[PDB]
Symmetry: C4
Subunit: 295 residues, 4 copies
Amino acid sequence: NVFDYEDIQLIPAKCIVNSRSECDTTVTLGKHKFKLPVVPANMQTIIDERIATYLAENNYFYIMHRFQPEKRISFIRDMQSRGLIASISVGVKEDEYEFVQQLAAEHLTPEYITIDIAHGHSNAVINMIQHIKKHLPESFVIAGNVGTPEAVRELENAGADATKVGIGPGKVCITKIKTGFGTGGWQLAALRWCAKAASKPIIADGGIRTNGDVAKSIRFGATMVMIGSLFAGHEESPGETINVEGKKMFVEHKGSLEDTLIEMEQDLQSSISYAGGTKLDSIRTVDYVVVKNSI
Amino acid sequence: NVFDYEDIQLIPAKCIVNSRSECDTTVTLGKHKFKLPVVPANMQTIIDERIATYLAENNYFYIMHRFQPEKRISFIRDMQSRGLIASISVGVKEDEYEFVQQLAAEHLTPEYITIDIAHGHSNAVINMIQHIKKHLPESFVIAGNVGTPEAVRELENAGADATKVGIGPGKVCITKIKTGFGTGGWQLAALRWCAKAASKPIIADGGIRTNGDVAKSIRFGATMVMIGSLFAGHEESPGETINVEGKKMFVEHKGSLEDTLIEMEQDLQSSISYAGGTKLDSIRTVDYVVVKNSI
Amino acid sequence: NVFDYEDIQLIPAKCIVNSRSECDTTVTLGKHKFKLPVVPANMQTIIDERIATYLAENNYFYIMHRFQPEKRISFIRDMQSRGLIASISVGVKEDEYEFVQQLAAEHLTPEYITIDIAHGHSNAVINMIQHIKKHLPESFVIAGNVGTPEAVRELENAGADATKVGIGPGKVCITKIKTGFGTGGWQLAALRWCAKAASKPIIADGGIRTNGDVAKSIRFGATMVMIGSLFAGHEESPGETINVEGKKMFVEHKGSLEDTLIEMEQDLQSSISYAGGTKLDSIRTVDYVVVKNSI
Amino acid sequence: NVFDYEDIQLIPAKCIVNSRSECDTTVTLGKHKFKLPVVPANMQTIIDERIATYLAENNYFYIMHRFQPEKRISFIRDMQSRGLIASISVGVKEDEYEFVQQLAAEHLTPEYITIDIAHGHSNAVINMIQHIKKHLPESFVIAGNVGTPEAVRELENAGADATKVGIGPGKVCITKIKTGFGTGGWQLAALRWCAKAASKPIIADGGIRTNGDVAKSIRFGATMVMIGSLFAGHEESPGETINVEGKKMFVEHKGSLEDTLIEMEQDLQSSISYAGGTKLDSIRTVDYVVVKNSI
């Protein structure tokens, strides 16, 4: 009964809008509303401070990476002084306990904290959730990564306000190849399985290959969809651009992040049109089929 | 229980003809009889006025595109004055309401009108059917595109004389990739599903890769099969031809449309031979299997 | 429940021989015994008179093609005068009725006659069987091609001494692509299905890609296996050979037919070894599995 | 119900270690403990005397090949005099009966003897087990190769201390292609099937493509995993190395065997981490899924 993104087709329902433009693609996560149910991967190869500022300035969700952890206290302070959301990443080591205590003492509370660990179903993650909720009670805590309903439950019960689902979701990623474990090759069914157990929002993390996979993630129960590859290789992205005969970034060149986000929004409005609704939640009650040949 | 064209093999029955030439490939749609149960895609990259005249002059069904909508009233008038069928396309916008009223006033009635919309299960399409049937009662109305039995039913009930079935049927088309919705990758099973509900003729639209897929569409309940790629890239087709070392059209060169239609007819006679009959409907009662590896 | 050659693995049983050389690969068809349960395709691109003489001289089964039908009466006479089996092909047209009568009058009786028609489940084939059995009662009659158990039954009941099973068996052959009918992509399961109904020997025709597919055909109930591609492109084969940097025939070059037949025999002895027997029929009672990914 | 390595994903359990370094990857086979549950293929293209000495000196299991059988008595004597395990291969021919008797007479007892035959379910193998156990009772006897639970049972019952499972396990190996028999294309399910019957340790032989397949073999019941390709093409391996623009060995160049074994150990510690344990046996009780598209 297991499948992935490429195996699913959603079934259209009666169209009730006269134009895509009528369809509302917004979503709320905790106390804030955002333009789209998508978020760039919280990695230094995908996001940086300039991209995060663009995103927050235009009401798109972001989560900053923790590659330069010494910069996070200033990052928070600065975003919040421009009236922008501060959304950061933390780990679970002893120095991250101090970091959090530090924040509590300057009375900085980031709107969002993501605990970002490969194998996030652990007491290390559980204790960090409990520590964060003690010292920064107003922070919205996203915990992961997990791959099972028992894990989602345990993390929600520890106090997480959301969980991030995906354990080496790519079909040929390192985790899958080297360990034999994870959601690689069945990420969509894994998401469904985890979502059926969840009382709190889920961020679906990875395995996204097309804009249609965003609608599919919403059907099987995501609130936010975390995306790597589709956001990689924009002019704004980390790295260098390579007439000539067509650019490459570090593998091809996708142009402007802004155009990509607009197209994502348009494609998602089309999805809502086909779902027979006018808003994002309409995607959640469409029927679907599992196709025979998907590759 | 879902599959597509490549997964199906039809099972032969006792041959009762001494020659393919004995097999009748004709079909009727409304008040007219045609040579073959196939029709070119109603798009400007596939059909034009010269091709439509060839087709009507030789008793092949066609449906003209609406890319130059201002030419349709003259097109109708001219075909009908040469004793040829006029088969046109319309949309659902306010100006198409006027267009239809225009026709009613010059007492032009095209034999066939196709309402051609991407997501055709809509009140926009339902109201256009009702408008057409009021002002041009003698016009044979084909409505689409749809992908479900509830849609076929609703459109038939609104007054359509046929429906066109297929929602981004190609395995790697835009609709599938960008929205996650439609019949892409299971077009044959979608056709079967829709056909079981239908009281009126169905035009099966797209996913056709081989001439054998025409017989397969007939088995699972099509009356006409709408074809794009197989008709693309003929000398007569829109675009330009490119010794040398073998032509290309815009991707390869298939030669003469007339030879393609002859071969389609011969291949279809072979299908009837294998079906144990002498006419097209014999294909409808053959057994079939769903193969394991189809790619 | 349908599959093909690539989906099947046969399961080994306790080995009871000390050497492959102990295993007997012979088979009987009618009144004669042959070295191997394989036979080249009866086509002019695969067999000719020199190859047929080699085969008969060494107790391998052959069936000559009918591309030069005027030569068949002399071919029979000449083989039989060298004490060799005469095995020919016939069609079902009125002149083939005369041909047969001709034979009856010179009291030439070929040991084997193959009625070779694409869609062999027909009254044309049934009447030719009955005609042959009237005028040449001692001839062993192989009739085909068929693809169903009802067809095998009808042909056996008409008087055939064997049937040939396969209707466009190749995964990308003409019949499959152009008509949508036949055993293409499920030839092994088709063979099994037909074999369960049969009271007389079956020749399994086509879809053979490896020497292991010969054992597989035997398991699912063949007596002789007709092979095209594996016998194509030998030095002895029709066509022309193309240092240099390695030969081609018309697509690569396989060397000597004799070496190919020796290797086929050795590979088949290995199959019998793995089947836990010492003779060909041991392959018929092994267990098997249907694998998940076969391509 | 049949599958292979590529179809399986193991499901993570709650992580209980603070570091991979906490996880114990050791295994015992008979009277000795080794670093890893892996062993190089006992073939001259993979192992030699220098590699065997490295392995034994560092507490990795090895099994020497028998390509130069005249060297085995000296090999044993020499290893054992350096305080190293002697692990050799034997066949089942009459001269191997003498070889064994020879050993018994110089009172050389190798710690490990592997009876290495393609089709090892045979009385030839059964009698060699019984001969070995009579003349060298202290030798740990591994018998194979087998592919069924009845074979494992018969060999265990004859006196084998372990069995080696795999009959042409590779997807495109000779045995599969030429005979139609064996575990090729379903090696993991074959291992599971055989393991459920076994009272003694199993060595899983072949079909390993990734380090994650080691954990998968452990889940479905291996004690040691025999590996060919992943160990082929190291600087230390048999053959010759080919700036320049990147080395090849005989197909690419993998560098140092020592680095490969370290990485294998690290990857396997990660597997134990994901399995929710601290030792190898934790992998044995994880849940798993069978994915839809695996290629």
